[PDB]
C-alpha cells in the first residue's frame, strides 16, 4: 500500500465487523458474508464517514470553518457531513434537491432531513442539482463573501481523496477474510467513490475476487466512465496501477435514484426478517436485490462465497414510510 | 477479580468489542466541566442500545432452555422490543410483543414510524393492549396462549430488567473501569433509570470496581420513592447471584421526566439539540435527552458530589426521534 501519506481524522477507530449471514446463506443456498460499514459511531453511521476522514482532514489543513456539500433531501452523505461539522465546531451548509418530486411529509421533514435540523445545518434549496460542482462553487463564493472560510465536499464525497476511505476498507476486508472461500463482492455504486476505492484496494489485496457494483442512479454506460476515472485517479495518487475491469449491473434501480422498487423493498424485508439487519430503499436494498438476482440468474463468475458491503442508509426508512 | 462469577453465566456475543468511551470537548467547553460518554448506542444490531447487553444473557438463557419464541412487552416506541425482535430475527426465533400506547397519542408517526416500523421488518407478532397494568401477569397470560400453539416461549420482562438481564451492565462497568484506567479519574456517572436493570447492573459493578465514583440515575418514568425500591431489589438480586454484597446507596433524581414516561419536555428537547449541535451525537426525547437534561441541571445547581469528570452512559434511543416528529 504505502497510502498513509494523506492526513486523516479518526472517526471510526476499530475495523467495522465482517460477519457471516447463516440464515440468508441457508435460504439462498450460497455463503453470504457482510461488511458492516453501517455500524460506525457517528450519527447512525454509513460509508460516507470513511470518506470524510480524509476530506475533513484536508478541510482543516486549509483552515476552513465551514463545510459545504450537496445532495437529495434524504442524502446520507449530507447528514454524515452535518454531524461531523457539528462535532468539530464547523458550520455546515447543504444544497438540497427533491429528486423525486414528492410532497410526502416524511420525505420532506423526517429521516435524514430531521437530523440536519438537529445538527443546525444551513439549508439551501435548489430546483435541481444539474451541475453540482458548479452550483457548489457559487454557494461557496456567496458564503465566503459573508465572512466564512468554506471547504467544498463534492456530492457523495466522491473525489479521489474521499475514495481513499474505501481503499482503507479493502485492507480491513483483506485481513478479515484470510480465514473464507471468497469468490465475489457486491456494493451499491452511486457517486462511485466507494466502488472505485474498493476496486483499487481489492485489485492489490484480493485479485481473485470479483467486485460487482450495483448501480442506484445510472445505466452501466453512464456509470462505468465515472468509476474508471476515479479508479485511475486513486491509483495514480497512491503510485499504483489499476488494470482491473469495472463490473456493473444496472438492472436493479428502476425507475430512478431515490425511488424504491419492489425487489429493493423485498431485499430490505428479507435481510431484516432472516438476519435482523436493516438495509435501505435507496441504496443497500437495491444493491442486495442485485446480489439475490445474481444468484437467481447464475450471474457471478462462480458459485463461491459472496461479500456484501453494507454502506448504510437505514435512517431513510423513516423518511420513506409510509410512501413517497 | 471480584466480578469473576460473571463467567458462570452463559452469554451470546451481540456486541463484540467494548463500545467507545469518548471525551466530549465541545460539550465540556460549554458546561465548564469534563464530560465523557459511554457509547452503548453504537452496537451492530438494529440501531443499537443498552438493551442489547441484557439480551446477550437473556437469550442465552432462552436457548439453554430450548425456547423457540421470545415474548416481551413495552410501549409502541420501545427500544427494548425493537432490539428483542431484531435478535429473534437474527437467531430464527419467533417473537411476540405486547404493546401499549403510554401517552394516548394519535400521531401517525408515533403509531407507525420509528421503532414500531422496524418491528414489522422483523416479522414481530404484535399484540396490542389497553395498558400494561400488570406486565408480568399479562406476559404470562400471553405465554399460555402461545404455548397452546405448540411454541416454546421465553418471557422477557419489560426492559429486559431481571437480575440476569442486568449482568450485561455489570459487564459494562468492567469495560468502563478498564477504559478509564490511567486515562481519566471519574467523579460521577449518569444514566437514565427506567425498568432499572441498567442502573442496577452499573451500581453493582461500579461499587466493586470504582467505589469512589458517584452513580446517578435520572428517572424517566417514576419518582425517587417509586423507583428506588425497584433499583435496590435488582442491585441486591444481582449481588447475590455473584456471591457479592452491595452496600452502596442508590442515587436518583426525579426532576427531569415530567409530565411523564414517553412525554417530551423542554429541557429534554434542549439537551437533544445541544448534543446534536455541539457533538454530532443523537440523544432521544424519552430517555437520554431527559437524563442529559438532568446532568446539565446537576452541573448548573451543583448537585454532584464534586466538580470532577462526569461519564454519561449513552443507552441509545435515537430511532424514537423519527416517531416523535413532528409532534405527538
Curated annotation (Swiss-Prot), chain B:
Catalytic reaction list: D-cysteine + H2O = hydrogen sulfide + pyruvate + NH4(+) + H(+)
GO biological process: D-amino acid metabolic process
EC numbers on record: 4.4.1.15
Domain of life: Bacteria
Entry keyword set: Lyase, Pyridoxal phosphate
Modified residues (N6-(pyridoxal phosphate)lysine): 51
Molecular function terms, GO-annotated: D-cysteine desulfhydrase activity
InterPro entries listed in its UniProt record: ACCD_DCysDesulf, D-Cys_desShydrase, D_Cys_desulphydr_bac, TrpB-like_PALP, TrpB-like_PALP_sf
Cofactor: pyridoxal 5'-phosphate
The keyword Metal-binding is annotated on this UniProt entry: no
Keyword field contains Lyase: yes
Function: Catalyzes the alpha,beta-elimination reaction of D-cysteine and of several D-cysteine derivatives. It could be a defense mechanism against D-cysteine.
Family: Belongs to the ACC deaminase/D-cysteine desulfhydrase family.
Subunit structure: Homodimer.
UniProt-recorded name of the protein: D-cysteine desulfhydrase
Amino acid at each position: 500500500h504505502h497510502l498513509t501519506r494523506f492526513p486523516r481524522l479518526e472517526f471510526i477507530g476499530a475495523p467495522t465487523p465482517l460477519e457471516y449471514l447463516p440464515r440468508l446463506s441457508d435460504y439462498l443456498g450460497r455463503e453470504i458474508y457482510i461488511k458492516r460499514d453501517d455500524v460506525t459511531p457517528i450519527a447512525m453511521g454509513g460509508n460516507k464517514l470513511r470518506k470524510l476522514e480524509f476530506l475533513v482532514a484536508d478541510a482543516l489543513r486549509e483552515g476552513a470553518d465551514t463545510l459545504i456539500t450537496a445532495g437529495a433531501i434524504q442524502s446520507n452523505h449530507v447528514r454524515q457531513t452535518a454531524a461531523v461539522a457539528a462535532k468539530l465546531g464547523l458550520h455546515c451548509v447543504a444544497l438540497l434537491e427533491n429528486p423525486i418530486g414528492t410532497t410526502a411529509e416524511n420525505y420532506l421533514t423526517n429521516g435524514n432531513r430531521l437530523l440536519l435540523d438537529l445538527f443546525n445545518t444551513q439549508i439551501e434549496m435548489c430546483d435541481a442539482l444539474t451541475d453540482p460542482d458548479a452550483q457548489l462553487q457559487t454557494l461557496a463564493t456567496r458564503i465566503e463573501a459573508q465572512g466564512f472560510r468554506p471547504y467544498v465536499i463534492p456530492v457523495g464525497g466522491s473525489s479521489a481523496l474521499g475514495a481513499m476511505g474505501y481503499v482503507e476498507s479493502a485492507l480491513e476486508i483483506a485481513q478479515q477474510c484470510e480465514e473464507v472461500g471468497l469468490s465475489s463482492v457486491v456494493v451499491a455504486s452511486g457517486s462511485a467513490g466507494t466502488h472505485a476505492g474498493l476496486a483499487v484496494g481489492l485489485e492489490h489485496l484480493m485479485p481473485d475476487v470479483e467486485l460487482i457494483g450495483v448501480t442506484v442512479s445510472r445505466s452501466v454506460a453512464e456509470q462505468k466512465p465515472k468509476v474508471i476515472a476515479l479508479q485511475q485517479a486513486i491509483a495514480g495518487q497512491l503510485a499504483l496501477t489499476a488494470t482491473a475491469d469495472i463490473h456493473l449491473w444496472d438492472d436493479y434501480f428502476a425507475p430512478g435514484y431515490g425511488v424504491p422498487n419492489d425487489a429493493g423493498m423485498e431485499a430490505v424485508k428479507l435481510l431484516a426478517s432472516l438476519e435482523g439487519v436493516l438495509l435501505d430503499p435507496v441504496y443497500t436494498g437495491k444493491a442486495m436485490a442485485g446480489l439475490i438476482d445474481g444468484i437467481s440468474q447464475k450471474r457471478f463468475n462462480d458459485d463461491g462465497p459472496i461479500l456484501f458491503i453494507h454502506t448504510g442508509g437505514a435512517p431513510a426508512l423513516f423518511a420513506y414510510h409510509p410512501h413517497v
